[PDB]
Design a protein around this ligand. Structure first.
Ligand code: HE3
Ligand code: HE3
Ligand code: HE3
Ligand code: MG
Ligand code: MG
Ligand code: MG
Lengths: 545, 538, 543
């Protein structure tokens, strides 16, 4: 153990032991010592314009690196401004550690710990300087292990400013967890051998890098059909697996659901019912196998017949080793996949789509032209989200951040900035509506300052369309969903970022290509015609719900 | 899936599915439908006299069977009376599911979920009748899996009285993880090789029945020294392992601690820092290996260099299969155990009131491998712990991190119900005896073959001596005397009162022969306590 | 300010400033310094045998004195054992301050007592800084005794009470004035136009600071009065001929009929939690709220006129604005007359069966309970019998209100009540179920030489629960247990024990037990067969 003049120095050392490359936040009196101590560290300080976005950026870092992104804010409003961001990260399973300042212990005030407990996996306040290092260290453990999530640590001003005696705690990382029991694995390998219509249902954990190779090997060896929840949207896609059946949870005409209904054997990997209500795919007819790092969060419509708890990669590798031949699709299974093939042909169409304001399909097509396996795509919440989700099978991004159970608007730009910082040599494209855009557009200054290579696209309709269409379907009239217009091109330029405004369908691709080629932040406003949205909304489960 | 006329019926079916054999509790208006439904069930309804004891009894059932014991109480005071008991169960790792009534949803109020959250692993209220069965099922999952604990389920009256649609969720039981990875086991087997002063620190999980054979197998093939926390007090004892270094956490003269400080390699099995402060034994200079069903609960003095998570039995069996030679003790290692040797020797009285040691010795003579012993909290607890090495009981319930008095008798009753053919001996002081003695009526009614021993000093000695040490004067630790023999007999139990030293052994022998509840008052002289206290961590 | 060697000395000093006469509790390592410091003060240390009872005893002290009773326990189980007791105190409005030990501040990093007590207290806080020690304790008392009284919990970290501290004792506050003149006049105008006015008395109307003023208001207005059980002692059938009984339990009370008939309902010191407004307020009458705190509005409780302030003052002023006594309307007179008929009929003939008939026991109890004695009642079927005949008990005070329906309260309430006025006798009554949950305090009673006579109605079961099950299911579950020799049980403590073996032995046994100067227990076998009749008079049966 070493002698520290400031708890803050210990905190910084603990952060470095974790391998933190940057911290996102806004300084304040109660927490400025930590900001100060970061000056003598290799950790980069990234000032944001609104704390909520520090949490969003941190979530992106966490999702990509598997190591928690870090947010640092002051007491009071500094902390309460993070709540939505922390809840979003926790619901999506993104590892995030937020260190928030607090009044001196003697002065204790806002009970932030009580406030964050509902939307975090871990929330604790350091009430003793000698606990400083372990509390911060355990924050990371909680955020990163098991089903990842967010963690909040409250840091009293006197504890961070005052001296402390203690040693840095080494970052343990992921424990060496055993695979599921061999006899249980052999039992599933046996079920697979006698299965006529098997299918893998992938959940969040299946999309983790740690399970990437294992998953690929298993799919390559068994050639068994795969469907995925939106949390696992990026685990597999139409272009890397011929038997991919799409993502389930949004649309009512997915081959994945048809295959789950036809299934005689369903194997869930890293899946939790929360990702997609079991009450909509599991009849209870097929033999259900649960594979994940934690026991099945058993439910009324989710009671596994065989539970394989343990290291997912380990289990999948062992399963792969006990599979002798590739599956021969039954007539029905093959028919379902052929249907999706035709279904995708119809969705793609060929067509000119030269109308203006632009048709969603024209925008989706132009977006697919600029997003390649070297580009990351982040998607906000709104009607455009549904359109993009409908065509996820045709995006070839290196990675796609779109899953958003809380349906939190404003996430795209911050997510993009966080993602770019992890791999600054690559480009990132973020897309949102005008409503979502204005909730986090203050970060455009941050992007300019960081010279982040991000292209942000705005689908402009001058309203909260996603809400409007639901009001209509239910009440046949609108309320609180329409607002005024804005000159988004001029808006973006006032930040010193490059701005574009699409005034015709013909200018779309050229504009996007130019904005993409810009070496730094760029914003493209795209007027959109949402009148066909009812057609798309007719393909949602909500329609039945 | 079925259509149930009463949510209560589904709750009972789910309980049967869980294999519950009895429920401990006290009925009340809000929850009486569940009690009524149990009438048509194979589940035995066991009325207790105070809810807290329903939690204590359930804990004993859970500890032994690995399946959660069940408490059933009504709303308000019915549930608040369970708090201390649920906290004790959660602290000791005893699987307990408590079902508490609540006012109708429309009427909601006492926030029981909020009250129980701090002392349970799982606390939830059923606000949707269609979630009834799943909420109950998950209560058991949460209480029985990983490191076991207590779970609380709040059941609104309207929810259990009203109709419900659902199916009995099959009992999946705690999922079976696989042993830690082969590469991880090879790494540990290798550290044990590159180690000169290795030692096993056993925690709670190491004592679970599923790990008994694997543990013995690992100890026998490696012959590595072993020390345990009190939660793991029964994992290994002096007579079943030559290199046992005693239980650590109480006395300042234990070999386990010396060996831990000397160690260059410490392998913790089923251990959590809460069982024994790492600050007391881990300097950090020793390579630290963690083996448990769950990741390590790291802290300033507990950061495992190697962390293995998985089925403990499988992990230990495989580890044992990778060890080729028994350990040859180093000079200092043998020296330390040499000292414990002398220590044991020194540990191996007609005054009245009786001397603690006289009582302890008289107790060891009646407690055998067929007898379960439960120990309450008080000075007598320290004495019995000092000589734990010489007790040879079937099982010993003693770990009590919260130092909750009154646990002994109800623990004994719950333990007896699991194996009715055997005898149970419980020991407490007079203070602890009265906090839960109302259950003597329950014992007589059940004809529980339990022998309760009361060390009588007419005070709260364990607190008195701490005050004596610090202030040289006593406060609030002395109370009046009682006729415990008559007290017990008023319940229909057999009572005895040791009036002389010679009468001790004969009285206990006589009481042990009693086929049913029996109580023996034993006057004790605590004047020597200051001496024993000098052996505790200061 | 001042320099203190131990935070504990400041606590004991703060308690003396509050006037605390004694402390109930069980010591432990984390809190023993406080018990030690108490050795040097005038404050008496009263060890109990179970912490729950320390809260029950403190509640009786607080209720009678108006000043918070004090419980002192150690950390962990010491604190969790108080919860039910603190909840019961809060629910009945009894001022109670509990001080629980806690682990050293530095060790608090590994039981969140503050969170566990918050749902059942008015005030729950932990001293996290020795400089806040005295104020936190002072504020605990202020919170418990002011406004509508309740329980307060204070967590004291061991290092804080053991370590030195700087600070001075904070004097006890105490105190509003009468409601506004305009208000009292507006109300008086409503009274002058009311044909069927009625006062509904709540908890605050029974506080001693209003016994005189209420008496005045009633004597000049002669308006009918009905009370919740929390205010059961505010007025009785004897000192006021237009008293309509306690409302909240039975479905045949004149109080309820007058409330439903009223064109003007004036609630004094009343909060909806004392008696569901959905049971008596249709909303037809003009509602006037008078209390030390604003009204706790709800669906069936929205006062058309709301007066907040010193009750005694307001009532004394309103009385001066009362022109003439009320001339009862025919319907009102008829309802009050029916209550008189009901009372005579309820008094029923010769019940000499054994086990004893509830009514025989009730009569015998009314005989020994005199106007000097305090009566405490536990929860169980006997409670309903006693409530039914509350009008015929003429005790100094009656502790019976129990919204939580918590069993085990009688004996400890009695012990606490006796300690406030040791020169008087206290009679406590419970069933065998409630008795065994707190009977460990019989040792405390013997040790204190408490002049308490505890009566046990014996049925060998939880009858109050059993009758509800019988009603709903035609069968019993979990409500029957074995018998006990209660005479020998009590004697084993060193108290006097009795067991009634025949009907004729009842009165002589009670007299003998009453004459005992110290703790006595009498077990009374009861035949609960007639309960269906009585239970049919409960709002519950109509539910
Ligand atoms: C208003 C709104 C969304 C935004 C819609 O507008 P644009 O972002 O302009 O998209 P578009 O649908 O008009 O293209 S999502 C949405 C969502 C439907 O629930 N997410 C929200 N997020 C926050 C933080 N507050 C309120 C909502 C409710 N919903
Ligand atoms: C008073 C007391 C104990 C009991 C001592 O008396 P006996 O049970 O008579 O034992 P002995 O020590 O006199 O033999 S333990 C003890 C413990 C030292 O902390 N456990 C407690 N449990 C509850 C539920 N409340 C308070 C305490 C504080 N401590
Ligand atoms: C069991 C019981 C009561 C006691 C009944 O028995 P006795 O006290 O023997 O009275 P008697 O009715 O048999 O005369 S009250 C009663 C009550 C009806 O709700 N209060 C309780 N208090 C606690 C602390 N736990 C559970 C209950 C549920 N109810
Ligand atoms: Mg919009
Ligand atoms: Mg004792
Ligand atoms: Mg009874």
């Amino acid at each position: 153990v070493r002698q520290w003049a400031h708890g803050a120095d210990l905190v910084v050392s603990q952060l470095e032991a974790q391998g933190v490359r940057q911290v996102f936040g806004i300084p304040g009196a109660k927490i400025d010592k930590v900001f100060d101590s970061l000056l003598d560290s290799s950790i980069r300080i990234i000032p944001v314009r609104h704390e909520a976005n520090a949490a969003f950026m941190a979530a992106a870092v966490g999702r990509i690196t598997g190591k928690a992104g870090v947010a640092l804010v002051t007491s009071g409003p500094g902390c309460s401004n993070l709540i939505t961001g922390m809840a979003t990260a926790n619901s999506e399973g993104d590892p995030v550690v937020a260190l928030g300042g607090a009044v001196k212990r003697a002065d204790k005030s806002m009970d932030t710990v009580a406030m964050f407990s509902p939307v975090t996996k871990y929330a604790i306040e350091v009430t003793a300087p000698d606990a400083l290092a372990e509390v911060v260290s355990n924050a990371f453990r909680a955020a990163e292990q098991g089903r990842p999530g967010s963690a909040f640590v409250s840091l009293p001003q006197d504890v961070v400013d005052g001296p402390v005696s203690g040693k840095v705690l080494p970052a343990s990382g992921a424990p060496q967890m055993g695979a599921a029991p061999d006899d249980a694995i052999d039992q599933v390998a046996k079920l697979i051998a006698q299965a006529k219509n098997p299918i893998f249902l992938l959940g969040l954990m299946a999309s983790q890098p740690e399970n990437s190779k294992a998953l690929r090997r298993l799919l390559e060896t068994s050639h068994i059909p795969v469907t995925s929840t939106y949390q696992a949207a990026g685990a597999v896609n139409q272009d890397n697996f011929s038997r991919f059946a799409g993502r389930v949870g949004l649309f009512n005409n997915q081959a994945g659901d048809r295959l789950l209904q036809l299934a005689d054997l369903v194997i869930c990997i890293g899946y939790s019912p929360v990702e997609y209500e079991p009450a909509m795919w599991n009849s209870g007819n097929a033999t259900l196998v649960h594979i994940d790092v934690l026991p099945a969060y058993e439910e009324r419509n989710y009671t596994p017949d065989v539970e394989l708890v343990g290291d997912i990669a380990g289990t999948l590798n062992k399963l792969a080793q006990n599979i002798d031949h590739r599956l021969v699709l039954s007539p029905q299974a093959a028919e379902i996949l052929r249907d999706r093939q035709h279904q995708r042909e119809l969705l793609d169409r060929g067509a000119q789509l030269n109308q203006f304001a632009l048709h969603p399909l024209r925008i989706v097509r132009a977006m697919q032209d600029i997003v390649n396996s070297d580009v990351t795509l982040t998607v906000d919440m709104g009607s455009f989200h549904i359109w993009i989700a409908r065509y996820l099978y045709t995006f070839r991004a290196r990675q796609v951040m779109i899953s958003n159970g809380q349906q939190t608007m404003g996430v795209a730009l911050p997510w993009a900035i966080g993602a770019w910082l992890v791999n600054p040599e690559r480009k990132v494209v973020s897309v949102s509506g005008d409503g979502g855009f204005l909730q986090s557009s203050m970060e455009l200054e941050t992007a300019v300052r960081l010279k982040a290579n991000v292209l942000h696209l705005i689908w402009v309709d001058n309203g909260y369309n996603m809400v409007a269409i639901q009001e209509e379907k239910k009440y046949q009239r609108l309320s609180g969903v329409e607002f005024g217009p804005m000159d988004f091109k001029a808006y973006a330029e006032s930040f010193g970022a490059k701005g574009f405004a699409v005034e015709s369908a013909e200018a779309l691709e050229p504009t996007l290509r130019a904005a993409m080629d810009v070496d730094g932040p760029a914003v493209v406003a795209i007027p959109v015609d949402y009148r066909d949205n009812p057609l798309l909304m007719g393909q949602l489960h909500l329609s039945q719900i």
